[PDB]
Every structure is written in structure tokens, then in C-alpha cells.
Design an enzyme around this catalytic site. Structure first.
Site, PDB file in Angstrom:
ATOM      1  N   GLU A 155      -0.385 -12.737  -0.361  1.00 40.21           N
ATOM      2  CA  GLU A 155      -0.265 -12.469  -1.795  1.00 40.21           C
ATOM      3  C   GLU A 155       1.178 -12.839  -2.080  1.00 40.21           C
ATOM      4  O   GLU A 155       2.105 -12.127  -1.703  1.00 40.21           O
ATOM      5  CB  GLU A 155      -0.492 -10.996  -2.136  1.00 40.21           C
TER       6      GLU A 155
ATOM      7  N   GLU B 209       8.834  -1.537  27.187  1.00 34.16           N
ATOM      8  CA  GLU B 209       9.175  -0.146  27.480  1.00 34.16           C
ATOM      9  C   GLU B 209       8.141   0.799  26.891  1.00 34.16           C
ATOM     10  O   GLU B 209       7.579   1.637  27.594  1.00 34.16           O
ATOM     11  CB  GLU B 209      10.537   0.211  26.897  1.00 34.16           C
TER      12      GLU B 209
ATOM     13  N   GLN C 151       7.779  -4.297   2.138  1.00 35.63           N
ATOM     14  CA  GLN C 151       8.523  -3.368   1.289  1.00 35.63           C
ATOM     15  C   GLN C 151       9.397  -2.531   2.212  1.00 35.63           C
ATOM     16  O   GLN C 151      10.594  -2.342   1.984  1.00 35.63           O
ATOM     17  CB  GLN C 151       7.555  -2.449   0.530  1.00 35.63           C
TER      18      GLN C 151
ATOM     19  N   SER D  16       1.183  -2.502   8.078  1.00 31.74           N
ATOM     20  CA  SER D  16       0.553  -1.317   7.502  1.00 31.74           C
ATOM     21  C   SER D  16      -0.916  -1.112   7.824  1.00 31.74           C
ATOM     22  O   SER D  16      -1.763  -1.164   6.939  1.00 31.74           O
ATOM     23  CB  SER D  16       0.721  -1.357   5.994  1.00 31.74           C
TER      24      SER D  16
ATOM     25  N   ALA E 194      -5.076 -12.100  -0.794  1.00 36.69           N
ATOM     26  CA  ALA E 194      -4.806 -11.063   0.190  1.00 36.69           C
ATOM     27  C   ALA E 194      -6.105 -10.477   0.766  1.00 36.69           C
ATOM     28  O   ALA E 194      -6.399 -10.645   1.957  1.00 36.69           O
ATOM     29  CB  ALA E 194      -3.987  -9.978  -0.457  1.00 36.69           C
TER      30      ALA E 194
ATOM     31  N   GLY F 279      -5.067  -5.680   4.289  1.00 30.50           N
ATOM     32  CA  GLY F 279      -5.773  -6.909   4.575  1.00 30.50           C
ATOM     33  C   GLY F 279      -4.852  -7.808   5.380  1.00 30.50           C
ATOM     34  O   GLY F 279      -5.157  -8.187   6.506  1.00 30.50           O
TER      35      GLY F 279
ATOM     36  N   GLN G 243       2.197  -6.667   2.399  1.00 26.94           N
ATOM     37  CA  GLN G 243       3.102  -6.235   1.351  1.00 26.94           C
ATOM     38  C   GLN G 243       3.914  -5.061   1.838  1.00 26.94           C
ATOM     39  O   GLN G 243       5.141  -5.110   1.845  1.00 26.94           O
ATOM     40  CB  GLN G 243       2.358  -5.797   0.096  1.00 26.94           C
ATOM     41  N   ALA G 244       3.226  -4.002   2.252  1.00 27.27           N
ATOM     42  CA  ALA G 244       3.907  -2.809   2.726  1.00 27.27           C
ATOM     43  C   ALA G 244       4.952  -3.123   3.790  1.00 27.27           C
ATOM     44  O   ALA G 244       6.132  -2.856   3.602  1.00 27.27           O
ATOM     45  CB  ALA G 244       2.905  -1.839   3.258  1.00 27.27           C
TER      46      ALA G 244
ATOM     47  N   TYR H  16       3.191   4.357  -4.076  1.00 29.60           N
ATOM     48  CA  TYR H  16       2.895   3.703  -2.809  1.00 29.60           C
ATOM     49  C   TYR H  16       4.172   3.062  -2.295  1.00 29.60           C
ATOM     50  O   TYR H  16       4.379   2.924  -1.089  1.00 29.60           O
ATOM     51  CB  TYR H  16       1.806   2.646  -2.988  1.00 29.60           C
TER      52      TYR H  16
HETATM   53  N1  LIG Z   1       4.462  10.001   2.597  1.00 32.89           N
HETATM   54  C1  LIG Z   1       4.028   9.011   1.779  1.00 32.89           C
HETATM   55  N2  LIG Z   1       2.808   8.460   2.015  1.00 32.89           N
HETATM   56  C2  LIG Z   1       2.327   7.469   1.229  1.00 32.89           C
HETATM   57  C3  LIG Z   1       3.153   6.998   0.107  1.00 32.89           C
HETATM   58  N3  LIG Z   1       2.451   6.025  -0.504  1.00 32.89           N
HETATM   59  C4  LIG Z   1       1.280   5.885   0.167  1.00 32.89           C
HETATM   60  N4  LIG Z   1       1.205   6.746   1.200  1.00 32.89           N
HETATM   61  C5  LIG Z   1       0.069   6.869   2.147  1.00 32.89           C
HETATM   62  O1  LIG Z   1      -0.529   5.586   2.353  1.00 32.89           O
HETATM   63  C6  LIG Z   1      -1.901   5.568   1.951  1.00 32.89           C
HETATM   64  C7  LIG Z   1      -2.109   4.506   0.880  1.00 32.89           C
HETATM   65  O2  LIG Z   1      -2.225   3.225   1.497  1.00 32.89           O
HETATM   66  P1  LIG Z   1      -2.521   1.914   0.611  1.00 32.89           P
HETATM   67  O3  LIG Z   1      -1.254   1.545  -0.124  1.00 32.89           O
HETATM   68  O4  LIG Z   1      -3.800   2.144  -0.159  1.00 32.89           O
HETATM   69  O5  LIG Z   1      -2.801   0.789   1.728  1.00 32.89           O
HETATM   70  P2  LIG Z   1      -1.577   0.069   2.487  1.00 32.89           P
HETATM   71  O6  LIG Z   1      -1.151   0.948   3.638  1.00 32.89           O
HETATM   72  O7  LIG Z   1      -0.564  -0.357   1.451  1.00 32.89           O
HETATM   73  O8  LIG Z   1      -2.268  -1.253   3.091  1.00 32.89           O
HETATM   74  P3  LIG Z   1      -3.157  -2.213   2.153  1.00 32.89           P
HETATM   75  O9  LIG Z   1      -4.539  -1.607   2.219  1.00 32.89           O
HETATM   76  O10 LIG Z   1      -3.040  -3.569   2.804  1.00 32.89           O
HETATM   77  O11 LIG Z   1      -2.497  -2.112   0.799  1.00 32.89           O
HETATM   78  C8  LIG Z   1      -2.251   6.953   1.429  1.00 32.89           C
HETATM   79  O12 LIG Z   1      -3.299   7.524   2.217  1.00 32.89           O
HETATM   80  C9  LIG Z   1      -0.992   7.787   1.558  1.00 32.89           C
HETATM   81  O13 LIG Z   1      -1.223   8.893   2.434  1.00 32.89           O
HETATM   82  C10 LIG Z   1       4.470   7.649  -0.087  1.00 32.89           C
HETATM   83  O14 LIG Z   1       5.228   7.302  -1.019  1.00 32.89           O
HETATM   84  N5  LIG Z   1       4.824   8.618   0.766  1.00 32.89           N
HETATM   85 MG   LIG Z   2      -0.575  -2.314  -0.324  1.00 34.43          MG
END
Ligand SMILES: Nc1nc2c(ncn2[C@@H]2O[C@H](COP(=O)(O)OP(=O)(O)OP(=O)(O)O)[C@@H](O)[C@H]2O)c(=O)[nH]1
Ligand SMILES: [Mg+2]
Ligand SMILES: Nc1nc2c(ncn2[C@@H]2O[C@H](COP(=O)(O)CP(=O)(O)OP(=O)(O)O)[C@@H](O)[C@H]2O)c(=O)[nH]1
Ligand SMILES: [Mg+2]
Lengths: 277, 426, 410
Positions: free
Chosen positions: C44, C227, C14, C113, C72, C117, C10-11, C197
Site C-alpha cells: 500500500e 541467540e 509506523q 505486525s 495490500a 496482509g 504499514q504498522a 492504531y
Molecule cells: N496497546 C495498544 N494496542 C493497540 C493500539 N492500536 C492497536 N492495538 C492493538 O492492535 C490490534 C489492531 O490491529 P490492526 O491495526 O487491526 O491490524 P495490524 O496489526 O495493523 O495489521 P493489519 O491487519 O495488516 O493492519 C488491536 O487488537 C489492538 O489490541 C495502541 O495504540 N495501543
Molecule cells: Mg494496519
């Protein structure tokens, strides 16, 4: 008395494949108590029994005195820890053709009674056995004793790990409860004699085994009926938190296993002190 | 995805009516009607609790087990009572005696097969089943008995799908029954060995939390039930919604149970403010953690402040910052390092749904695993012995085909269960 | 010449939609113009659907949008092995169907990310199956590593010690950005206690765009994926560098935007701007791959860096001399039409193995232990797809990433 947990080390001989695939006898024995693995740290135990020491020999070295204390009114445990096919069932009960923890079970049966028969008419002896198997999974419940051991063995799970004969799948525990009472004086005495044959120590049944060891590492329930009440529990007095205990860690001389062997030689070494609580 | 609730006994049943009263509205399902859902999201995941037959009739996939007709005949003759397919009603017109051997061995044991029948019709509904939700009280003849059986059977039929259990453990101060510890000790026994997630809600812990945290002066049962059902909705159903960071039964279990006992939790809801006035909206978030983590507000009887935690699961459900959430949790973990067991930089499984409780802006279910619940099974276990010793109302059990070794069994078991739980408090 | 890019998780999707936005935005190709050059993977549906429902809807081919309606699961195993497996073939097919259509490409892109998962697991084998099918190319994976203290998933480390070890040998150069040390960036360098997030994603979604996207894109100093790993890993351990971005200024508050190179480069070594804890002192030790984009004069760089090489308090590299891979792109960076990212005309996505994380890594590793301390949140992955192995064996992994980033410097 504040006595420490004794630990003997029995190395089996190189099996078919190992001695086929060549392999070489990796351990080196010096004196009657220390073993070395290459250029490493020389592990010292209460006794080290090379492949060659006979089973009768393996007895006198471990079990013998235990049998003497359980009759003096003390509790004694003896359990064989080891990486599957390292010799546990061979030393704990098994056939005749190797080192110590030889025929622990049968050898103990005779010794126990040979001692009783030789005592005066008074002081009646009351021995009653318990033969039980595999705590990780579903726990399943001289001649007179041997007939039972035979019955028990029959029922026990069968396992296999390295060119060995019948390879366990449970922690079989054989309990001997020796009771004694001087008819004249009336002063009784008793003692439990646990003879445990541990399951493989090697690292989905492996996640299950890591989950079982982890859980036991932090202690397990204190129940008496169901799940709680199993492996890493029966040969408990055979490792730590205990009575006159004696552990016989089994080891494979083949280098193919060098690692695990080092893991085993470490258990015994640590257990040695056994800082029971 | 799928889910199959189990209404064991009267209580567990009475609550069924409230758990379904709620949940439905939290899914736009009118009595027999369909999905009127104010939105479109309260439908993509319903399956978890219903089944497709007609096209407007999504029927709750639960089981109603009880040896007392009148009960289910009050739940089936009232409001939402006419949504359950009759097949669901596994009654036992026998004498639902208040013994832990009536609704489990004699009367309930009959009605069981006619239940499992349906629990299979619902399981084999469609898609993939996740687990079953179970509501009941451990203080009655059916319930702790018949409902505790329903599971022992469920867990033999699908040792794969999960089993959340919502138990109304016998409140301390005053017992709304007499043999209570009998019906209880006997059911907890069955629990510690079948379901793998139990959410214990006290009755008097509710009154309190319902008479002082809701200036509510006449807290009828319906209410208590209602409050409880509010938590079990936040747990399950909720997580079966989207979220920045969503979890699901498994996630709650694989993150809350350090040691196999099964361990019992203590649920806590977030916005718990009195109607008019209080509607302070102080719900930015620090206000929810303020709530959830206080002593009072723990549906359990015991007070967290009386024993460390092993795990915690703030299952929030309302748009918020993964920062102001992930953050708060921390300070909380540091202001109270004292009680939170050795792993500080943790012990707070943050969960975050999106859509909140229908009419609210932001909520957060709390599922605490505080070794503290040791001091409850103790309670129960005590009451037993003090009365078992004299075999008090035991003839109502044995006379129903029970065993003098059965009671022994349970107590011990559940009694040992107390032991273990301490193995971590230390 | 050209590349492809695979936005996984997902991330990564995004961030993908974001990096993909900035693109057309600076190439005059509105909603419906040419044709992308990447793909989208997720187990997902609802998320890739956002690319199917929301903006930039018809700028993609329902063919470069892979989904597994299934589940997911925030657990690597289930994603890598069990489930994730089923899709991979199909996934590959596109990166073999899209890899053919082109003309002498240079490499893949992985936008993922780390701690997810579909993002950790899956890719693990995607990059895995790539290193074999096209060993002869660049594999620059743009990652968004675990926030140093503000993680999300309860298991996160399980999923990130596992995506590192499996991808390490396939290519590392995996940028690694952790909001925990960055999120603070959103509170110290952007001001907002309301970081969804969806933001931390826009960020990595940025740093990553600097990796693949623009780099696989022509410029005055191109840098292929290979590289990276070459100029970035001193040793076989799938070494883990850290991702850092420079103009992380707020598009509302302050406005000094016009911050010539000389500034944006110094803003990379201050520990409070590196998407990974944040506390390695000035900068502090490394191979660094300074990827610049926008209007930048090579002398400006081959000077701004010179000034740095002599700050000493930034104490560098060992046995080999010079650890500064200067990557210059043309097209400036982009920003979500209206998110919260400033929108400058030049940026510096510098990612090294040492730097502040460096510390960042350790401060994020330590976290992990505390929880794992006895399997910790293991039961959350097992039932999803993982063993005591993947966790413990991905911990040991990073361990040699704490030694690596230590040895290559100090
Ligand atoms: N700087 C910044 N960091 C963020 C933001 N949103 C989330 N994070 C960082 O990302 C982490 C949250 O990750 P999750 O969204 O739980 O997991 P994911 O990286 O989406 O991967 P999945 O586990 O597959 O969902 C936290 O420890 C935050 O430090 C944001 O808007 N800005
Ligand atoms: Mg996520
Ligand atoms: N919070 C609530 N507790 C309840 C409710 N009804 C009962 N109870 C509690 O549950 C226990 C009594 O149980 P029930 O009505 O559930 C008994 P059940 O009908 O399952 O079986 P029988 O023995 O066949 O009557 C007791 O602790 C009551 O005090 C309720 O509506 N809400
Ligand atoms: Mg009733």
C-alpha cells in the site's frame, strides 16, 4: 419400526502401482463383520466384504433385501461412500471383478422384475426411473430400465482417482419409483428406490469441495429447482435422515491411503446409528 | 477499484438521482463540472465510480434501465441529470407495464443490449474493476424486471467482479403499488442468484425513521431516497477511502455471508439527528452504536430485536479510537448475547475509514445480516400466494409473453430462500 | 557486527519510523546527517509514502523504501503468495545489496505486525527467503502480535496463525505483542481511552526496536538474532514467545521515571504489562530474554533477576537449569518526540515463551476459535488470498505453542 441404517464395508484389491510399488494388504478381517487396521480399533459393521467377495456376493449382502422392502411398499436407499478409486462406481454399477455393491444397479433391475413377473395377474405394477447427475455443480437430468441406465451412464461425468476405470465427477443418482395396485381390492402401494453413487470423500476445486461439504454440514436450502438440490443430498437417505437405508463405504487397502481409509471407516461407523432428525 | 452502478426501473432510477446527487458532492463533482473537492483525497479513488475522458468530466459509470421514457426523461431533464453520457440511457419506449414480464422480457429485453454496451464501455474504462452498485425498487415493471436483468447479464460478463445490490423491498403496512409482490418475488429470485451483496431498504421503515428520528413532517420521496443513498455511500465509496482498518465489498461479503444464499442485510446510518436542536453532537461513539443498534433506525421493516444476527458490519468513517470502537462493539455483543447468534466474542465486523461524510464529524454505516430478514421475504412471499392463487393481475404479465411456471419458479425459489435462512436462526 | 532491519507492513513501518526516530535522537544525527541501515516494505503506497512525505524524509534512500502501488489486502495469502510475491525479489535485492555493503554483519531484523496482509504474509516469505540465503546469521523478528480482545482486522488470526507457522522454521524468537492485552496498557499504564492504531504501533514499534535495532547494535552483553531462537525455543515448533516492555509510563501524568532496574524488571512479570492478554499471575513459567537498554549495571541485573529466580510464585523452567538470557545494550530507549511514551533512561523488553502469555496466547487463541467456529471470517481472506488450510493449519500451529509454553515450565 425404528430400524437402524445398515452399513457394509467393501475393500478393493491392491491396484497396479500399489502392488507394483509393493505395498501390503493392510486390513485384517475377523468374522463376517469386523475389520482391523494394524494395532488399532477393530471396526464392526453390518457386514464387511473383503476384496474377494464376488459382485453377486456383494449383492445378496446389501441390495437384495432392500429390493424386497421397496416392493412391500417401503422406501429403500443404497449409496456407496468412498475415497475416489476405492470402489464406488465399481460396486454401484460397474464391471465384474471384485466385492460387494457389485453391480448394484443392473443386479437390482433383474431382481425387481423377476419378483413382479412371478406375481398373479391382478395388482398391476408401475415402475418409472429417473437418472440424474452432479449436484455440487450444474445438475443435469428389466431391459427398459437397462436401456435407460445405459443412456444415463453415457451422459454422466468421468473422474479418476487411483488405478481404477472411469473416475466420476458428479454424484450420479438413479431413482426407481415402484408403484403397486391390487386391481381387485384396489389397495395401492408405492416406494422410492434411490441408488446413489457418491463422489470422492477425500479432503480451487478442493476449496469448492470443502465449501460444499461445510455448507451441507449445516444443512442446505430446501429448493427444488436450481443450485439447492445436489450432492450430499441425493445419497441422503443413503447416509442419514432416512428409510430402509444401506450404505456401502468403499476403502483402499493400500497404506498409501491409510488415513482416508480411516476417515471412511469412521463415517460408516458413525452413520451406523444414524440419529436422523 | 472500478464500480458500475445500475439504475433498474423507475424507483431504482429515481434513487440513482439521489445516490449520485450525494456521492458526487462526496467527491466534489459538479453537474458536468470536475473535481472541486474541498480536499485532495476525494479523488485518488474516484475511479470506482467514474471515467476519464475530457479532464473536467468524470462521468458516473452507471446504467439507466427503464421501459418508461418519462422517468429517465425526468432524471435527465433535472439537476445532475446532465452528467450521464447518453450512452448510459438504455430506455425501452415500449409499454413499461407493471408486470414482472414487461421490463424483463418484452420491453426491457430490447434496451438491454444498448445498456450492456455501455456497462462495458465503463468497465473497460481503466485500472482494475471491483464491482457494480445497483439501485432500484422491487416493486415495478422495469426495475425488478429490467434491472434484475441488467445484473443477470453483468454476472455472466464478469463473474469475478462483485455485485452490491441496493433494493427497496416492498414496505409492509402500505404498498405504493398493487402487483408489488409480483414485481418483487420475481426480482428477489434474480437477486438470490446473481448479485452477492444486497442492502434492502424499506420505504415505510424510512418514513418512520424519517418522521420520528428526523422530526421531518413532510418526508417527500426525494428524502427517503436521500437517506438511503446516504447508506450506500457509507458502504461502497466510503471503504474505497483510507482507514486504520479498511474493508471493501469483498471484506463486507467474506465477513457477512456465512451461507451462499446471498443473504440480505438491513442498512442503518449513524448520526441521524434532526437539524437545528438535536445537533447534540453526542457522537463520541457510544452514541453511534447506541443509534445503529436500536430497533428503529434499521431501514428494514422488521425489527432486529425479533431475531438473532449472523453478522454485522459497522463501517465507521470518521477519526476515532480503534479502542473505543473495538471496545464498544464488545459490550454491545454482551448486553445482547441473547440475539446475536452463538458466536458472541464476534459477529461484529468492525470497519474504520478516516474521512467522514463531508459535513459531519463522525458517522458509521451499519450492515446487518439478521436471520431476521426471514420475516420479510415471508411477507412478500405471502402477498404473492394470496393473490397468485387467483392469478390477480396476471394477464398483464402473461399477455406480455410470460409463463405460469415463471411465477411458480420465483416464489418457490425466494420462498425456499426463507427456509434456509431459518437453518441458522436455529 | 552491524545489522540490517526490514520493517514490513504499514504498522511495522509506523513502528519503524518511531524506532528509527528514537535512534538519531540519541545519536546526535538530526534530519539530514548519515545513512540508515534498513528497508521499508508495503503493498500500500500511501503508508511508506508517509516516510516519503513526513518527518525523517531525506534520511532514507528511495532505494530502501519498497512499495507495490498495487493492493495490500488484509489477507496473508494474497500478500504472501499472489501479490506479495512480485515484490519479494526486489525486496531481497536490497537486503542483499545492503547486506553486502557492510562489514561482517550479525543479522536481519524483521519489524512486522503479525495480523496484517503485508505484515503477516509477505514477511512470511521474506524471512523465508532469508533463512536460506543467510542461514548463517541471526533472524530476530520483532513482532506486534494480535491484541487479546481488541483486535482490528476481522480475520487477524487467519493472518497470524499463518505468519507464525511459516516464520517459525526460519527463526522464531518472534516477539509477539498484542495490544488487546497491551492496549489495556494504554488504559491502565498510560491512561488514554483515545488509542489510535497509530499508538499500538508506536508501542510494538518500541518493543521491536529493542529486539533488532539496539541489539544488532554494540553493547555490554550483545545478543544476536540466532541467540534468540537458541536461548528462546526449547522445541522445533516455531515457538511463540511474548513481548513485554518495562518503562511504559506516561509522558505527562505521573513521574517517577527514575525507576532503577530493580523496579523496571519486576514490572515485566506482572501480567498487566505484556502486550498479550494479561493474567498469567505474577510471572509464571519460561525461557526469557531480558533485553535491557540504557544505563544498567550488570550486577544490578545479576541480582534483580536473582531476586526474581526466588519469588517462586513466578514458577519457571523444566529440565534445563536457568532460563534467563540477559541482553544488555548501551543507548537508552527513545520516544516519539511528543507521542505519549514517558521517556526513561533504561527499559526492559523481555520476551519469553511462557510468562503471562503463556495465558495471553491462549486468551488470544480462544478468541480466534469463537469466530472461526465454522470458517468464521474466512470469506475475508479467501477472496484475498487464503484457504481453510492456512486458518485451520495455523490454529493447530499455535496449539503447540500453548503446549510448548506449558511444557517448558509448570
Ligand atoms: N496497546 C495498544 N494496542 C493497540 C493500539 N492500536 C492497536 N492495538 C492493538 O492492535 C490490534 C489492531 O490491529 P490492526 O491495526 O487491526 O491490524 P495490524 O496489526 O495493523 O495489521 P493489519 O491487519 O495488516 O493492519 C488491536 O487488537 C489492538 O489490541 C495502541 O495504540 N495501543
Ligand atoms: Mg494496519
Ligand atoms: N424510497 C423511494 N421509493 C420509490 C421512489 N419512486 C418509487 N419508489 C417506489 O418504487 C416502486 C415503484 O417503482 P418505480 O418508480 O421505480 C418503477 P420503475 O420506474 O422501475 O418501472 P416502471 O414499471 O416502468 O414504471 C414503489 O415501491 C414505489 O413506491 C423514490 O423516489 N424513493
Ligand atoms: Mg417508471
Amino acid at each position: 419400526a425404528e430400524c437402524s441404517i445398515k452399513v457394509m464395508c467393501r475393500f478393493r484389491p491392491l491396484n497396479e502401482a500399489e502392488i507394483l510399488r509393493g505395498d501390503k494388504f493392510i486390513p485384517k478381517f475377523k468374522g463376517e463383520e469386523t475389520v482391523v487396521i494394524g494395532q488399532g480399533k477393530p471396526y464392526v459393521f453390518d457386514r464387511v466384504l473383503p476384496p474377494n467377495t464376488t459382485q453377486e456376493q456383494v449383492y445378496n449382502a446389501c441390495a437384495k433385501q432392500i429390493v424386497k422392502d421397496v416392493l412391500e411398499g417401503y422406501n429403500g436407499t443404497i449409496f456407496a461412500y468412498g475415497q475416489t478409486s476405492s470402489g464406488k462406481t465399481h460396486t454401484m454399477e460397474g464391471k465384474l471383478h471384485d466385492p460387494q455393491l457389485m453391480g448394484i444397479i443392473p443386479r437390482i433391475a433383474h431382481d425387481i422384475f423377476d419378483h413382479i413377473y412371478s406375481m398373479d395377474e391382478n395388482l398391476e405394477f408401475h415402475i418409472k426411473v429417473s437418472y440424474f447427475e452432479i449436484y455440487l455443480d450444474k445438475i443435469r437430468d428389466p431391459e427398459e430400465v437397462m436401456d435407460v441406465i445405459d443412456e444415463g451412464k453415457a451422459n454422466r461425468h468421468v473422474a479418476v482417482t487411483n488405478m481404477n476405470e472411469h473416475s466420476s465427477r458428479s454424484h450420479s443418482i438413479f431413482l426407481i419409483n415402484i408403484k403397486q395396485e391390487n386391481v381387485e381390492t384396489e389397495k395401492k402401494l408405492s416406494g422410492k428406490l434411490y441408488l446413489v453413487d457418491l463422489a470422492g470423500s477425500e479432503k480451487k476445486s478442493l476449496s469448492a469441495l470443502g465449501n460444499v461439504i461445510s455448507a451441507l454440514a449445516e444443512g442446505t436450502k430446501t429448493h427444488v429447482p436450481y443450485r439447492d438440490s445436489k450432492m450430499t443430498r441425493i445419497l441422503q437417505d443413503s447416509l442419514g435422515g432416512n428409510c430402509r437405508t444401506t450404505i456401502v463405504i468403499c476403502c483402499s487397502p493400500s497404506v498409501f491411503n491409510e488415513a482416508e481409509t480411516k476417515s471412511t471407516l469412521m463415517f460408516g461407523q458413525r452413520a451406523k446409528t444414524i440419529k436422523n432428525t | 477499484r472500478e464500480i458500475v452502478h445500475i439504475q433498474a426501473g423507475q424507483c431504482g432510477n429515481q434513487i440513482g438521482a439521489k445516490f449520485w446527487e450525494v456521492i458526487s458532492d462526496e467527491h466534489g463533482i459538479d453537474p458536468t463540472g470536475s473535481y472541486h473537492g474541498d480536499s485532495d483525497l476525494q479523488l485518488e479513488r474516484i475511479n470506482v465510480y467514474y471515467n476519464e475522458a475530457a479532464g473536467n468530466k468524470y462521468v458516473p459509470r452507471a446504467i439507466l434501465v427503464d421501459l418508461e421514457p418519462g422517468t429517465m426523461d425526468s432524471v435527465r431533464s433535472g439537476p445532475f441529470g446532465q452528467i450521464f453520457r447518453p450512452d448510459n440511457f438504455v430506455f425501452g419506449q415500449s409499454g413499461a407495464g407493471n408486470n414482472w414480464a414487461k421490463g424483463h422480457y418484452t420491453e426491457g429485453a430490447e434496451l438491454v443490449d444498448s445498456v450492456l454496451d455501455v456497462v462495458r464501455k465503463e468497465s473497460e474504462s481503466c485500472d482494475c474493476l471491483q464491482g457494480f452498485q445497483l439501485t432500484h425498487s422491487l416493486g415495478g415493471g422495469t426495475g425488478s424486471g429490467m434491472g434484475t436483468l441488467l445484473i443477470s447479464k453483468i454476472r455472466e460478463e464478469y463473474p469475478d467482479r462483485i455485485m452490491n445490490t441496493f433494493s427497496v423491498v416492498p414496505s409492509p403496512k402500505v404498498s405504493d403499488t398493487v402487483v408489488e409482490p409480483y414485481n418483487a418475488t420475481l426480482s428477489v429470485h434474480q437477486l438470490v442468484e446473481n448479485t452477492d451483496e444486497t442492502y434492502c431498504i424499506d420505504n415505510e421503515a424510512l418514513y418512520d425513521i424519517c418522521f420520528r428520528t428526523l422530526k421531518l413532517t413532510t418526508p417527500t420521496y426525494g428524502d427517503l431516497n436521500h437517506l438511503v443513498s446516504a447508506t450506500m455511500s457509507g458502504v461502497t465509496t466510503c471503504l474505497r477511502f483510507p482507514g486504520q482498518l479498511n474493508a471493501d465489498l469483498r471484506k463486507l461479503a467474506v465477513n457477512m455471508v456465512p451461507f451462499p444464499r446471498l443473504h440480505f442485510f438491513m442498512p442503518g446510518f449513524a448520526p441521524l439527528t434532526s437539524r437545528g436542536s438535536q445537533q447534540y453532537r453526542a457522537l463520541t461513539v457510544p452514541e453511534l452504536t447506541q443509534q445503529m443498534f436500536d430497533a428503529k433506525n434499521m431501514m428494514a421493516a422488521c425489527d432486529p430485536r425479533h431475531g438473532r444476527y449472523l453478522t454485522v458490519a459497522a463501517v465507521f468513517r470518521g477519526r476515532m479510537s480503534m479502542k473505543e470502537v473495538d471496545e464498544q462493539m464488545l459490550n454491545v455483543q454482551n448486553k445482547n448475547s441473547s440475539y446475536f447468534v452463538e458466536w458472541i466474542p464476534n459477529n461484529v465486523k468492525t470497519a474504520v475509514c478516516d474521512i467522514p461524510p463531508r459535513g459531519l464529524k463522525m458517522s458509521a454505516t451499519f450492515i446487518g445480516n439478521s436471520t431476521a430478514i426471514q420475516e420479510l421475504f415471508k411477507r412478500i412471499s405471502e402477498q404473492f400466494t394470496a393473490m397468485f392463487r387467483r392469478k390477480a393481475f396476471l394477464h398483464w404479465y402473461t399477455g406480455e409473453g410470460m409463463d405460469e411456471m415463471e411465477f411458480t419458479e420465483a416464489e418457490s425459489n425466494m420462498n425456499d430462500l426463507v427456509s434456509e435462512y431459518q437453518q441458522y436462526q436455529d | 557486527r552491524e545489522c540490517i532491519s526490514i520493517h514490513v507492513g504499514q504498522a511495522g513501518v509506523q513502528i519503524g519510523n518511531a524506532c528509527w526516530e528514537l535512534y538519531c535522537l540519541e545519536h546526535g544525527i538530526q534530519p539530514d546527517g548519515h545513512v540508515p541501515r534498513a528497508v521499508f516494505v508495503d503493498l500500500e503506497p500511501t503508508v511508506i509514502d508517509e516516510v516519503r512525505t513526513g518527518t525523517y524524509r531525506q534520511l532514507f534512500h528511495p532505494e530502501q523504501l519498497i512499495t507495490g502501488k498495487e493492493d495490500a489486502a488484509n489477507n496473508y495469502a494474497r500478500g504472501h503468495y499472489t501479490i506479495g510475491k512480485e515484490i519479494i525479489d526486489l525486496v531481497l535485492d536490497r537486503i542483499r545489496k545492503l547486506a553486502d555493503q557492510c562489514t561482517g554483519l550479525q543479522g536481519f531484523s524483521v519489524f512486522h505486525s503479525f495480523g496484517g496482509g503485508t505484515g503477516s504474509g509477505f514477511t512470511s516469505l521474506l524471512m523465508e527467503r532469508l533463512s536460506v540465503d543467510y542461514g548463517k546469521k541471526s533472524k530476530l523478528e520483532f513482532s506486534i502480535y494480535p491484541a487479546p480482545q481488541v483486535s482490528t482486522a476481522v480475520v487477524e488470526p487467519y493472518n497470524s496463525i499463518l505468519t507464525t507457522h511459516t516464520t517459525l522454521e526460519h527463526s522464531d524468537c518472534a516477539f509477539m505483542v498484542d495490544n488487546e492485552a497491551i492496549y489495556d496498557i494504554c488504559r491502565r499504564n498510560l491512561d488514554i481511552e483515545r488509542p489510535t492504531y497509530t499508538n499500538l504501533n508506536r508501542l510494538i514499534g518500541q518493543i521491536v526496536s529493542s529486539i533488532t535495532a539496539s541489539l544488532r547494535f554494540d553493547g555490554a552483553l550483545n545478543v544476536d538474532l540466532t541467540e534468540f531462537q537458541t536461548n528462546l525455543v526449547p522445541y522445533p515448533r516455531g515457538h511463540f514467545p511474548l513481548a513485554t516492555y518495562a518503562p511504559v509510563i506516561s509522558a505527562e501524568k505521573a513521574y517517577h521515571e527514575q525507576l532503577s532496574v530493580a523496579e523496571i524488571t519486576n514490572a515485566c512479570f506482572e501480567p498487566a504489562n505484556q502486550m498479550v492478554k494479561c493474567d498469567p499471575r505474577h510471572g509464571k513459567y519460561m525461557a526469557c530474554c531480558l533485553l535491557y537498554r540504557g544505563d544498567v549495571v550488570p550486577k544490578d541485573v545479576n541480582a534483580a533477576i536473582a531476586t526474581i529466580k526466588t519469588k517462586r510464585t513466578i514458577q519457571f523452567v523444566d529440565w534445563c537449569p536457568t532460563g534467563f538470557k540477559v541482553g544488555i545494550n548501551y543507548e537508552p530507549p527513545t520516544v516519539v518526540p511528543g507521542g505519549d511514551l514517558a521517556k526513561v533512561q533504561r527499559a526492559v523488553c523481555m520476551l519469553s515463551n511462557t510468562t503471562a502469555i503463556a495465558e495471553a496466547w491462549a486468551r488470544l487463541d480462544h478468541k480466534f476459535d469463537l469466530m472461526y467456529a465454522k470458517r468464521a471470517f474466512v470469506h475475508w481472506y479467501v477472496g484475498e488470498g487464503m484457504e481453510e488450510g492456512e486458518f485451520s493449519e495455523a490454529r493447530e500451529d499455535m496449539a503447540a505453542l500453548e503446549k510448548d509454553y506449558e511444557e517448558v515450565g509448570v
